[PDB]
Amino acid sequence: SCSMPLGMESKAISDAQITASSYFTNMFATWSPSKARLHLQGRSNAWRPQVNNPKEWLQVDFQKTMKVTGVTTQGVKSLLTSMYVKEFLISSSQDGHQWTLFFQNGKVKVFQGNQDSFTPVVNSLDPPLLTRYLRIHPQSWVHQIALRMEVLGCEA
């Protein structure tokens, strides 16, 4: 039951609720955090940080506690170039300042993400997170960090 899309694609999570450490901008496109939406089509249809390094993060504030049972991620093709995140970490917070990394067997879980530019990949959170804030941390990528995502779960 608890595997409903929490609103990235459908826009139930509005633009103001999605933030990042940085985003890439130029006069061809604006790859803002609010473009990080599963299946989004268009000119600048993903989040890209301004630099490619593992200190970058994308954040979603659900604005209330949600039960999170999984995440779906996708890359983008732009200007003939596929860009996707291959591996990533998840952290979560209830307040927004104190962040807990998602662990498995007593250390940080490294999620295996995408292997192409348009196939969505679902990763489960076991045990599920009860959380207001979720951050995704790119650890490895092909060509450029690029993300479109969905969060899966239910109300709590």
UniProtKB/Swiss-Prot annotation:
Disulfide bonds join C2-C154. Changing I90T: In HEMA; severe. Changing W57S: In HEMA; moderate. Changing Q139P: In HEMA; severe. Changing R37Q: In HEMA; severe/moderate. Changing P128S: In HEMA; mild. Residues 2-154 form the F5/8 type C domain. Changing R37L: In HEMA; moderate. It comes from the Eukaryota. Changing R132H: In HEMA; mild; may cause reduced phospholipid binding. Changing R135P: In HEMA; severe sporadic. Changing V60A: In HEMA; mild. Changing R37G: In HEMA; severe. Coiled coil: none annotated. This is Factor VIIIa light chain. It comes from Homo sapiens. The gene is F8. The chain holds residues 2192 to 2347 of 2351 of the full protein.
